């Protein structure tokens, strides 16, 4: 629309303008973070405006006799001299940097910043029911501050802070259904139990049922007593050392019974939501300007060949159907083989015409 | 076909109860947020509660706070407004609404309506 | 916000076929532009007109149309049909106690 979002100083010499709070991270390349910015050339006395983009991993200590205090890891900047304009080495004006200059008048001077593709969304990880200060996760951040250099103390009431958020949607083209199988013989069983899950899609949304098909052949003559079909969220997050979590988002347990040299076939109906997921702490949501309830992190889109290794939060789902079956001739039946397989899909909301804030908040 | 069938409404005494349902039919309960809104004989549109369900959230004016309690069935896909102690300016046309979970908050499917009595 | 009053300065209008129609609603405090407008015909449920204070529902005419200018919202018929004489409401959904304008009822004249 034709609204903008500004915010002042502490002391109100300098303004911020911007258009947007969430760009969308296009696979190739992200909406360009353009603003103005409002200085006051008879305050500043010979002083340069900096305009920074700041994309930091924010993430607490748990060595540390203090709760409650966190440290931020810096994964990208980006710096804009804007008050004094550099000598033709400036970005063209869009169309909303022309409207806001010409509406402030001659003291609202442009930046824009392009973020570089292959960099993290805007990320939330999940606080602990007792946890009191900054959630931890990815967020970008543009700061405007009055300074002589670079290299210098930054005061609080020279700069402005603005909250901002990289996201994206789900394609527009789905791709192939999302379909495993697997073959299971035993030690001795010389006969195989074949298992068999899809998906009615590769692509959902948050909120929307997940449909799996699952279709068990068992010619052993073992009996399949439970099945276990959950939607699992995992993170890779890259902070000082590579690591990757698993979280079941969504279970469904059925005392689902297959006997031997038998088949089954059957259709279960799984929705993840976070109502029933908030004690989870450390999972991934998606990025909060402030506070504000976000759904589960949407999974993140990566370029079409390799690219990886990320130093961010990468979010992926996948839908785990586990098959139980009860041994025998070495236990006493008390532990159970498992066969499993897993199907990933993509969990994001689909393409907008508008701003995603709902709005509703008391 | 995307709609809302409400049930449950009719004569009360001023303190009895009444269960109102909204059999949702064509959308998910995690993905839409249910509302109901009464309209009084004359009057214009109040709303009365809401509920989300995908973050486990329920919202009552704040003159039905106490006596009103608004819930949903997943599996059935069937929300419900269970409204105690009821007087009789609670007569009214009460309508069960849908609004986007994400990125919407406007009304945009409503179910036909209710008419709740309430005299002695 | 303690509870958002949504003021429709016209409570009744008459106006012919083809006449352009602008109702009004005034919000007591800044609600952004988190307004709707609905139409209820008699003894029928209300149906979403317009939402942001400037989007079109889909299958509405494009005879409605939807504008924001302060804290004031308006609602703009143009060409006026017979099938849009009813009543109209506008709605803020920017804090959870969402409140409706008192209505506008739109007649006919001769």
């Known amino acids: 629309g034709t609204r903008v979002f500004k915010k002042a100083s502490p002391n109100g010499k300098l303004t911020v303008y911007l258009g947007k709070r969430d760009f969308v991270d296009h696979i190739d390349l992200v909406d360009p973070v353009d603003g103005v910015v409002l200085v006051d050339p008879e305050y500043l006395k010979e002083r340069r405006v900096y305009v920074t983009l700041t994309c930091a991993f924010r993430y607490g200590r748990e060595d540390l006799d203090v709760l409650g205090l966190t440290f931020r890891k810096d994964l990208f900047v980006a710096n804009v001299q804007s008050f004094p304009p550099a000598p033709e080495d400036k970005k063209p004006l869009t169309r909303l940097q022309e409207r806001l200059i010409k509406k402030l008048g001659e003291h609202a001077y442009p930046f824009t910043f392009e973020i570089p593709p292959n960099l993290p969304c805007s990320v939330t990880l999940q606080p602990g029911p007792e946890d009191t200060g900054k959630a931890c996760g990815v967020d970008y951040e543009v700061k405007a501050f009055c300074a002589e250099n670079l290299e210098e103390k930054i005061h609080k009431r020279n700069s402005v802070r603005l909250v901002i958020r990289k996201v994206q949607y789900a394609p527009e083209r789905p791709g192939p259904q999302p379909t495993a199988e697997t073959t299971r013989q035993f030690l001795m069983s010389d006969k195989p139990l074949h298992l068999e899950a899809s998906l009615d899609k590769e692509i959902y949304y948050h909120g929307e049922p997940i449909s799996v098909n699952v279709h068990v052949t068992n010619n052993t003559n073992k009996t399949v007593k439970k099945i276990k079909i959950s939607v699992r969220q995992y993170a890779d997050i890259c902070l000082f050392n590579t690591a990757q979590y698993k979280c079941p988002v969504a279970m469904e347990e059925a005392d689902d019974t297959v006997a031997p040299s038998s088949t089954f076939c059957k259709v279960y109906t799984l929705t993840p939501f976070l109502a029933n997921n908030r004690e989870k702490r450390g999972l991934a949501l998606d990025g909060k300007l402030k506070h504000e309830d976000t759904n589960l992190a949407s999974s993140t889109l990566l370029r079409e060949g390799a690219n990886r290794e990320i130093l961010g939060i990468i979010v992926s789902y996948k839908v785990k159907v586990k098959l139980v079956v009860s041994r025998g001739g070495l236990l006493g039946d008390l532990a159970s083989s498992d066969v499993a397989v897993e199907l990933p899909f993509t969990l994001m909301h689909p393409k907008p015409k508008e701003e995603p804030p709902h709005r509703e908040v008391p | 076909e995307v709609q809302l069938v409400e049930s449950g409404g009719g004569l009360v005494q001023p303190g009895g109860s009444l269960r109102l349902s909204c059999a949702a039919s064509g959308f998910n309960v995690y993905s839409s947020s249910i509302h109901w809104v009464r309209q009084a004989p004359g009057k214009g549109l109040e709303w009365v509660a809401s509920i989300s369900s995908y973050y486990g959230y329920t919202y009552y004016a704040d003159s039905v706070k106490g006596r009103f309690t608004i819930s949903a069935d997943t599996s059935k896909n069937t929300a419900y407004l269970q409204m105690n102690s009821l007087r009789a300016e609670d007569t009214a046309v009460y309508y069960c609404?849908?609004?986007?979970?994400?990125?919407?908050?406007?009304?945009?499917?409503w179910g036909q309506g209710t008419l709740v009595t309430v005299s002695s | 916000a303690s509870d958002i009053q949504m003021t429709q300065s016209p409570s009744s209008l008459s106006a012919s076929v083809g006449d352009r129609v602008t109702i009004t609603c005034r919000a007591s405090?800044?609600?952004?532009?988190?307004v709707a407008w609905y139409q209820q015909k008699p003894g029928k449920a209300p149906k979403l007109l317009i939402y942001s204070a400037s989007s079109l529902y889909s299958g509405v005419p494009s005879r409605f149309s939807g504008s924001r200018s302060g804290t004031d919202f308006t609602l703009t018929i143009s060409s006026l049909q017979p099938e849009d004489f009813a009543t109209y409401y506008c709605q803020q959904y920017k804090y959870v106690p969402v409140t409706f304008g008192q209505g506008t009822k739109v007649e006919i004249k001769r």
């Open positions: 405090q800044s609600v952004s532009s988190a």
């Open positions: 609404a849908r609004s986007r979970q994400f990125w919407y908050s406007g009304l945009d499917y």
